[PDB]
Paper text:
However, because PPi is stable under normal conditions, inorganic pyrophosphatase (PPase) has evolved to specifically hydrolysis the molecule. Here, we solved four crystal structures of a family I type PPase from a strain of the pathogen Acinetobacter baumannii. The crystal structures of AbPPase showed that the enzyme has a typical Rossman fold domain that is highly conserved compared to other PPases. Family I PPases are hexamers formed by two stacks of trimers.
The space group of Structure 4 (K149R) is P41212, with three monomers in the trimer of the asymmetric unit. Thus, it could form a hexamer with the trimer from another asymmetry unit. K149R showed a similar activity as WT AbPPase, indicating that the mutation of Lys149 to Arg had no influence on AbPPase activity. In addition, K149R could be co-crystallized with PPi, suggesting that substitution of Lys149 to Arg did not affect the affinity of AbPPase for PPi. Moreover, Lys149 in all the monomers displayed different conformations, and mutant K149R exhibited full hydrolytic activity indicates that this residue is not important for substrate binding and catalytic activity. In the catalytic center of K149R, M1, and M2 were not located at the same positions as M1 and M2 in the wild-type enzyme. But this variant still displayed almost the same catalytic activity as WT AbPPase. K149R was also sensitive to monovalent cation-induced inhibition like WT AbPPase. The positions of Lys30, Arg44, Tyr56, Asp71, Asp98, Asp103, Lys105, Tyr142, and Lys143 in WT and K149R are also relatively the same, indicating that the conformations of these residues are crucial for binding PPi-M3.
Residue numbers in the entry:
A (entry chain C), B (entry chain A), C (entry chain B), D (entry chain A), E (entry chain B), F (entry chain C): 1 to 173
Write the structure that this text describes.
Amino acid sequence: SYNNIPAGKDAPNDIYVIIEIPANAAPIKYEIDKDSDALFVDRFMGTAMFYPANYGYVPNTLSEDGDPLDVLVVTPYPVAAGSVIRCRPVGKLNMEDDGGIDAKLIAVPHEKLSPLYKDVKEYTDLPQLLINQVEHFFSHYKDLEPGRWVKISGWEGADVAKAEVIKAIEAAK
Amino acid sequence: SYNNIPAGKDAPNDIYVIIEIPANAAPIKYEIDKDSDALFVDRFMGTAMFYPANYGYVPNTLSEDGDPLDVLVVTPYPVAAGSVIRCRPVGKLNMEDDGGIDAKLIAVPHEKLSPLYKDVKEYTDLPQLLINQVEHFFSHYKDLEPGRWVKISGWEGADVAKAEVIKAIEAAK
Amino acid sequence: SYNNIPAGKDAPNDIYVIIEIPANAAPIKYEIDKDSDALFVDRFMGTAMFYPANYGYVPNTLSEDGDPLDVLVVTPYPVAAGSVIRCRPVGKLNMEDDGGIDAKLIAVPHEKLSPLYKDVKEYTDLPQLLINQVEHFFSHYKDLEPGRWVKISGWEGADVAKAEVIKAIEAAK
Amino acid sequence: SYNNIPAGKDAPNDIYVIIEIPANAAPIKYEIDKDSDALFVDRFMGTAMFYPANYGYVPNTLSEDGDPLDVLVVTPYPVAAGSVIRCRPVGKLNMEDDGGIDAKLIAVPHEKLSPLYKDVKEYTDLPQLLINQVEHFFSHYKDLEPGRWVKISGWEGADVAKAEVIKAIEAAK
Amino acid sequence: SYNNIPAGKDAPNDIYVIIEIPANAAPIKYEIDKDSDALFVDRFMGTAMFYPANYGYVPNTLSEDGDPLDVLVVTPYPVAAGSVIRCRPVGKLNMEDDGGIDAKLIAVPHEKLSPLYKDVKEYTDLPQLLINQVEHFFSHYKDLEPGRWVKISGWEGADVAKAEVIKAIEAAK
Amino acid sequence: SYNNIPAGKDAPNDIYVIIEIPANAAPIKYEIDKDSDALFVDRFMGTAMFYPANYGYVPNTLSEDGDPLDVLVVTPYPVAAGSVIRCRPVGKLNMEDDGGIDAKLIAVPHEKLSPLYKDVKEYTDLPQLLINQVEHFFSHYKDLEPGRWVKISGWEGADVAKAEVIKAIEAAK
Ligand SMILES: [Mg+2]
Ligand SMILES: [Mg+2]
Ligand SMILES: [Mg+2]
Ligand SMILES: [Mg+2]
Ligand SMILES: [Mg+2]
Ligand SMILES: [Mg+2]
Ligand SMILES: [Mg+2]
Ligand SMILES: [Mg+2]
Ligand SMILES: [Mg+2]
Ligand SMILES: [Mg+2]
Ligand SMILES: [Mg+2]
Ligand SMILES: [Mg+2]
Ligand SMILES: [Mg+2]
Ligand SMILES: [Mg+2]
Ligand SMILES: [Mg+2]
Ligand SMILES: [Mg+2]
Ligand SMILES: [Mg+2]
Ligand SMILES: [Mg+2]
């Protein structure tokens, strides 16, 4: 099962993220069910938008909302829902949503998977438009769903993002 | 495993369906294997047709033929093979095929997943062309495979479909 | 060439729209060039959004910005960029953008192309969520491009939309 | 324009086919308009089926019904709508439909485009399942559209198909 | 889990292959993890190439590199990553890579899945171009990853391939 | 027609490229026919490879092989075959093939189309793996076609690439 996957081979610089929603996918919000490891349709999203990067979570972590830590992973090609990417965090997007505090990390593939991100040490080393697209997506993707909303606080860098991994690993143990 | 998913949160009005074949997919007839939870290729379909709705089954149900209850689920976008949709039955298509009695329910997503089906209470509230496409698909998709065949009896409404769910949940106990 | 296509077989109830951008497509903003009939990439759009309906124009019309009249066409499947669809207007979305007044019509296919829209006489007969998605898309698709913006005024019905077609046809003569 | 393309480099053994509908495409029945060269949506097809081969016509041919000769082209990958394939006829499917006589040729790519068809000299050298799929598609794809219908007479071989090309090239002069 | 799937219903003539990479897919090299059954991204491949057949392994086998036996499966349509296909071996491609001896079998679906391969008894009954594409892919897909390389020895037939299946099954006990 | 499109609004820093083959497309080598403006299938390519960037030509130019100048354009999303991209050259790949000298440019979208490439002044500002993928593709894509082959000479920078545009513009006038 997914719970047999550690949070990382060497956290926080070498972690695993289980993908729930591929980048550039149809507007279906999938979530993995802890009790079955199965991909559930949480909802069909209301706006004409798509997640700008692959979206999932670090196994064996615990965030403030009670679920594993949320991570977006930038990849050269969208990966299959349910697949697992070895990656490295480069930034943290601080937000609050209708349910409470909701920070999410952004990460890039580990060097063993690709050389493309070797020089991406901070989220500011990704394309500025991509960073803006990520923030704009979370700012607006709940606009057509009543009772759902997002407040953006802002971005923090790779040191804070790596800290967040450690926090969530320690919270689960 | 899939067997940890209940038949529904509040059956028969609120059920779960595990999808084997997405709507509008390539002509590969996948089936989930009970003893591995794995998606098997049952066959490559012989006709140039596609399933007009997502196709799957209700976990923890048992029909009189020893398999879970079959369900077609209408969705605004096709859902991934192996994913699970919370939905609501609105009708039943009575058929017999080369394997015996073969009724299949038709369902729409629960209102928590989409607002688009709030007025669909009976299968006759779906577009008539879609109902005709479902009937036509099952009447013909086996035409080019030796020894496979379908007889269509007709449709029944939401109350009959809900009673079928109750009966199949009972049988699994 | 495209200019041999009339504005309609029986405008304004029966018109042709040349599609530039398919519904649900990648964020490439194509525009057909008057001087060559060729599809140009006007831009790669800045936001993680998609046109919620097929987007194009009525040939042999002239709208307020000097170009043919803009029309969104709802279809059961997205139609290819550069293809031509026989359709019928059911509404008008009034907007202003960074270039000036920018109304766009919304239309559904002629009954010879699909039976699915026979009961759609006004834009309010389309799904409310789709109407909201169209408004939300135009409100936000320029959010990440400096100097580009949109202000929505509101909708008008089929009779107003049909009068806009007549106005743009006569303005071209 | 398309009318500048000859019927072939060396007809009837070496012909050109302009594709209207790719193999395995969405159920949109496109047709090229003679007076604009533009791809029109003739209709959205009513059944859950797809064309099993690429479908188009030979330019600068004229059958006795006033339209160019129809050709299905088998290719290793589906080709884009509006593109032109150099190919070689290997058979003829005789049909009558709601519009009158409706024979369609079947062809394979010229050896300069692919080595995969060197041993396909007759339509019976193609996979039997594919031949059956073509027949089944035309027998059923109009089933859900009022007033549309097909009668299938049977197949003829490559020599008959080649004579049909010669006859249709003659008629266009 | 996957390990409940036997190596075959009647090995070596009738085997199961769990697919990791679909034919003609994006250049994502998935591998199933033994400890979790989950699909991991091993890497994003460096070259602009795709696997010419579906790629996976036989469960409950052990090959020379300590992992289950590798098999390519030719299918009429690419099958999803993680799905399981009943097939039959027809050849063996002998290679050495940067990790050591690396033979891979090639197989076609069982006749219950498709009639299209009934006459394919040896790998030489597949299209020569496909065999060449498989050799060329393995010869070059690692060309842009330093430290990864492949040397091709050549092919052996179905009887040798079937003996390799028996060898890997017994080696797992 | 395409010939109404100038080589650029302000060559060599602001040019138009007509795309024949989208990035990451199926292995179909399309070429636009000068006499009809139609997209022809030149061949189905022999190797399991794909063009790593969109491929096409500058209208109203003349290269040493007698045809308009060949250009690859890097884009965030593959563009439709036959569409036209406003772009700017950043490098030149010198090659000779079975027909003679065969240099090709690489370009990025003009700033009016996207901000993503503002800092890409030279081909060495693109990802090194992408540059290697382009060279590797041309080195190998003819490996399975007899009589077709490529010799790589090497890359030159943006100043030489801009020169090549001017050379080919002047050659056509
Ligand atoms: Mg969360
Ligand atoms: Mg979550
Ligand atoms: Mg949230
Ligand atoms: Mg089943
Ligand atoms: Mg069943
Ligand atoms: Mg059945
Ligand atoms: Mg406009
Ligand atoms: Mg416009
Ligand atoms: Mg505007
Ligand atoms: Mg036609
Ligand atoms: Mg015809
Ligand atoms: Mg007909
Ligand atoms: Mg191996
Ligand atoms: Mg392996
Ligand atoms: Mg290897
Ligand atoms: Mg050239
Ligand atoms: Mg060329
Ligand atoms: Mg060349």
